[PDB]
Amino acid sequence: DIEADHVGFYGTTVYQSPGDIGQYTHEFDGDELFYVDLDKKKTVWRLPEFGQLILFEPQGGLQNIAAEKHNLGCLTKRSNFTPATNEAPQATVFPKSPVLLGQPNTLICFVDNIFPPVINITWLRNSKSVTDGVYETSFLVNRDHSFHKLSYLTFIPSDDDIYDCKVEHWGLEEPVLKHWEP
Amino acid sequence: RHFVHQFKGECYFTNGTQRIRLVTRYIYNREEYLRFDSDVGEYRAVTELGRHSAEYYNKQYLERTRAELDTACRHNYEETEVPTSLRRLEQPNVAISLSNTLVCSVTDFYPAKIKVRWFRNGQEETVGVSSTQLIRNGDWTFQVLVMLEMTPHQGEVYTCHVEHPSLKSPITVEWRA
Amino acid sequence: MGVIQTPRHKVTGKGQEATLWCEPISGHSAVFWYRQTIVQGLEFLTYFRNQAPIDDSGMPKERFSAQMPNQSHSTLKIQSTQPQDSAVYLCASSRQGQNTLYFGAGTRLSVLEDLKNVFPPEVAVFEPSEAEISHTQKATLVCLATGFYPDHVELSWWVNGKEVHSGVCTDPQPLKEQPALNDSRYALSSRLRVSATFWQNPRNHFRCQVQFYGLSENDEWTQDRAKPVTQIVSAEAWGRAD
Amino acid sequence: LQTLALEVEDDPC
Amino acid sequence: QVEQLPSILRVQEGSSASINCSYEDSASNYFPWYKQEPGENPKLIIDIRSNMERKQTQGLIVLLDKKAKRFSLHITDTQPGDSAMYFCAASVRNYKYVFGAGTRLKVIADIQNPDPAVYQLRDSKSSDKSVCLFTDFDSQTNVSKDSDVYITDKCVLDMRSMDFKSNSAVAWSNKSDFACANAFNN
Ligand SMILES: *[C@@H]1O[C@H](CO)[C@@H](O)[C@H](O)[C@H]1NC(C)=O
Ligand SMILES: *[C@@H]1O[C@H](CO)[C@@H](O)[C@H](O)[C@H]1NC(C)=O
Ligand code: NA
């Protein structure tokens, strides 16, 4: 809606009740700069080289989480406890680079239309769950105030390997699995 | 039965820092009810939920919030974004394969500005070319796939032409049967 | 409104555990703790917002902690009190980002090596000089609080049962009776100047009140002399028609 | 070099 | 770190006072000033933000030099009510304010009709001390050298009943060889 050369998302805070689920992130031009690990009280830059140059004290993340704790209570009471409606996420599996057998690659599961930001994104290798080699981004904000999350599986392409990205969300009657094969 | 509150601070930059727009959003369950807009200059209720708070924010936080255009948006851009995000340059990797349709895979580049063209025996092809939307990998790299529908013949040469700000000269990759 | 801090004064010995209380202004989510000393001024200790600890970069790395059990009270706990902990601990609340901080009156904490050296003040009032009345038509009373340790005193002038501030001058800081010793007792002087007619009225009552802060009920006392609890020591005088 | 958060201001409730 | 100078500022009624502070953190963007009367609490009196350079509000002027990393408070036409302890602060964000060491600003009273004289107060039936009073002297004052002889510092009282303020100093002693003649300049 607002046209500009560059857009920076600073102070982005999400809080949920019940359960004390919170998130704090920064973005530039649609890419996550960093998130603040609320449990460890540490800033975690998506590109560590950026954090070697730029300081963000994690206090800013904690403060905005705490203030959003207060704000959620005010708005929940004012809205007569109108609950959030669980949307159905959509998923897409694609490789980071063209797939060559034997050369390491990364499977990217792009899941959009996530609300509320609670999701289980898991990978299946030969229909069995894969634990190691998995990384996912923070909940990234959308203009319609839903979220999107990306999960990465680092793998070695092989003849006898088929992969599935399984998504579990409250707004899905059954878990959705998106298949990918070489 | 879950309830969500969101805070969104947004800085919009055009022509360096010559034009800065600061937007602050208060959202309850995907409903933005209160917003500060530096173009408007004051807090405004967006929906029903924010009428009880719009005047309070203007009576308590307006002057401080307006200063955040310089204090936060200008500071963050000039001091932190120019040496890290606005200086990032990732060279694209180009590869061709046949699906018939030739798929030119341009991957792992940053920033988004890219030009990819298809050439057959030295002449640019446009009629049969179809490109995917720019794909954001989420790791500060982009990728895009450019397709050319063709019929492979013995001596034809197909070339994928890619231009990017991270390239002094364009990348060329040829494909033959 | 106003931030309320309790206790106003705290005198304790080495090794005891002191807890300091702060009540922020109702509706204020941001809570600050500051150490105040004469040399270093105000020093940041810790910051809270909505009961959550956010920044404790100014806290001592041992024996110090801060908590917010509910949304209306914050506690500053010092374990195994030591003499260098002696300072004024201010608490501040705020309700706006980077705006006015509302400070409390602070808790003056003194940690002494030996509690055997705490003594209450001796308070005396001296009636105005007749030469001063003759030459200036004004009468200056002088109050002397002497031989007290530590320097936790609050001096007030009470005329006819009501505290007075006009015409009063109290020493900004007390003086050491024996400046060589570092555990020396202190002396404090104050002046009350009134018109010659007001002093010549024998129905006017002048009382010098010195609130002293020392041990509490929970403090043990083994010496034979009277235990020097927090107490008010006063001296009085009446107007004189000669 | 330090990036600054945009700070949440409390709702009057 | 915020360095505040001077630590002590003695100024005469009607004259201007200036407190200068410097800061190390170039990200600092909020600069409040706090006034503390003795025993009372600090109270915000004036502030400034990084986007501004000058601000005048009723005889209070604050300057900000982002490049030089210095900010100053200026009290034009000082009054005795301004005598207090002043603290300057620099804030990057809301979660920490970095304060200076403070400035004890003493505005010295413009005594109009000086009448320097030393007086001896009547002794008390409960104290073994003779008390001398040095009163009604002007801004220039001397303080003391003997043991068991105690002399306090000068003190300006305001009756506000009349239009009369005055300075006073008190000396007292236990010894029998004590006299009010030269007990304040020995
Ligand atoms: C995610 O998985 C855990 C266990 O693996 C389960 O307890 C939780 O309910 C799941 N969450 C969702 C939203 O399905
Ligand atoms: C961009 O800003 C510069 C000053 O920083 C100005 O000289 C230039 O004209 C601007 N560009 C446009 C297109 O207005
Ligand atoms: Na300081």
Residue numbers in the entry:
A (entry chain A): 1 to 182
B (entry chain B): 5 to 103, 112 to 189
C (entry chain E): 1 to 242
D (entry chain T): -1 to 11
E (entry chain H): 4 to 147, 150 to 191
Question: How is this structure described in the published paper?
Answer:
Plate-like crystals were used to collect a 2.65 Å full native dataset that enabled solution of the ternary complex structure. Crystals belonged to the C121 space group and two equivalent 4.1-TCR : HIP39/I-Ag7 complexes (RMSD 0.216) were obtained in the asymmetric unit. Recognition of HIP39/I-Ag7 by the 4.1-TCR follows an overall canonical TCR-pMHCII docking pattern. Whereas both CDR3α and CDR3β loops are aligned over the peptide-binding groove, the germline encoded CDR1αβ/CDR2αβ sit on top of the MHC α-helices. As seen in other TCR-pMHCII structures, the 4.1-TCRα chain interacts primarily with the MHCβ chain, while its 4.1-TCRβ counterpart largely contacts the MHCα chain. The TCR-pMHCII interface covers an average buried surface area (BSA) of 1172 A2, a value somewhat lower than that reported for most other TCR-pMHCII interfaces. The most obvious conformational change involves I-Aβg7’s Arg68, which switches the positioning of its side chain from an initial arrangement away from I-Ag7’s peptide-binding groove, to a locked and HIP39-oriented conformation in the presence of the 4.1-TCR. The TCR-bound coordinates show how Arg68 shifts its side chain towards the HIP39 peptide, creating a novel set of polar interactions that pair Arg68’s ε and η nitrogens with both 4.1-CDR3β’s Gln98 and the peptide’s E5 and E7 residues via salt bridges. E7, on the other hand, located in the P7 pocket defined by Tyr65 and Arg68, interacts with the 4.1-TCR by tethering to the CDR3β’s backbone nitrogen through H-bonding. Of note, the Arg68 rearrangement was accompanied by a subtle yet key movement of the HIP’s E5 residue that resulted in proper positioning of the 4.1-TCR’s CDR3β on the HIP39/I-Ag7 complex.
T-cell specificities recognizing hybrid insulin peptides (HIPs), which arise from the fusion of fragments of insulin chains with peptides from other hormones that are exclusively expressed in the insulin secretory granules, have also been implicated in T1D initiation and progression. Thus, the I-Aαd/I-Aβg7 pair conforms the murine major histocompatibility complex class II (MHCII) molecule I-Ag7 that is uniquely expressed by NOD mice. Transgenic NOD mice expressing the I-Ag7-restricted 4.1-TCR, cloned from islet-associated CD4+ T-cells of diabetic NOD mice, spontaneously develop a dramatically accelerated form of T1D. More recently, we have shown that the 4.1-TCR is also antigenically promiscuous, recognizing seven different I-Ag7-binding HIPs that result from the fusion of various chromogranin A and/or insulin C fragments, including post-translationally modified peptides.
